[model samples]
Target: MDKKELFDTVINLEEQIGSLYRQLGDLKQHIGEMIEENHHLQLENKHLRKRLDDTTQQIEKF
Candidate 1:
């Protein structure tokens, strides 16, 4: 290939690599948000379970 053609090919490859890197960063951020959301849901579920148990106990006492 001519020198100009080779230079163009390298430039194109570099651009593709940069785009892929950005996508990787975005995926990492999304995963972090999902994990945080999951943690909150787990806490809420535990709280609800405890409340349910307490209510059941109160009814049993009567």
Candidate 2:
């Protein structure tokens, strides 16, 4: 086999692998952000429900 051709092919494969690795990290970051946002929303929803319950009880007393 031509040594130069094999060398070029190896380089190309290395570049492609690097690109795929970067993209995988990017996708993981996006998923992490989505999960964090979901958790934040859940906490906010819980707080709001508690507040609503307290307000209803206060109004009932009046």
Candidate 3:
């Protein structure tokens, strides 16, 4: 509806695509100490998923 809300929805979707790409490409590691890195990324991905969902709802509301 509003300019700001549409901007946020697009941004959120762009970010979600980036996260999905990162997770999909993270499957080439052998056995290393990437646990922390992956953990943080996963957490960020989780939050982004929720953010995307919320933004979708907000867009539908307007």
Give per-model TM-scores.
0.82, 0.68, 0.46
Ranking by TM-score: 1, 2, 3
Model 1 lDDT vs. the true structure?
A: 0.98
TM-score winner, 1 or 3 = 1
What's the best-to-worst order under lDDT? Answer: 2, 1, 3
The lDDT, on a scale of 0 to 1, for candidate 3 is 0.86
User: lDDT scores for all predictions?
Assistant: 0.98, 0.98, 0.86
Candidate 2: misplaced stretches above 4 Å?
1-11
Better of 1 and 2 by TM-score: 1
Candidate 1 residue-wise lDDT, 7-47, digit = tens = 89999999999999999999999999999999999999999
Badly placed stretches (over 4 Å) of model 3 are 1-32
> What digit string (tens of lDDT, one per residue) describes model 2 on residues 1-21?
577998999999999999999
TM-score of 3: 0.46
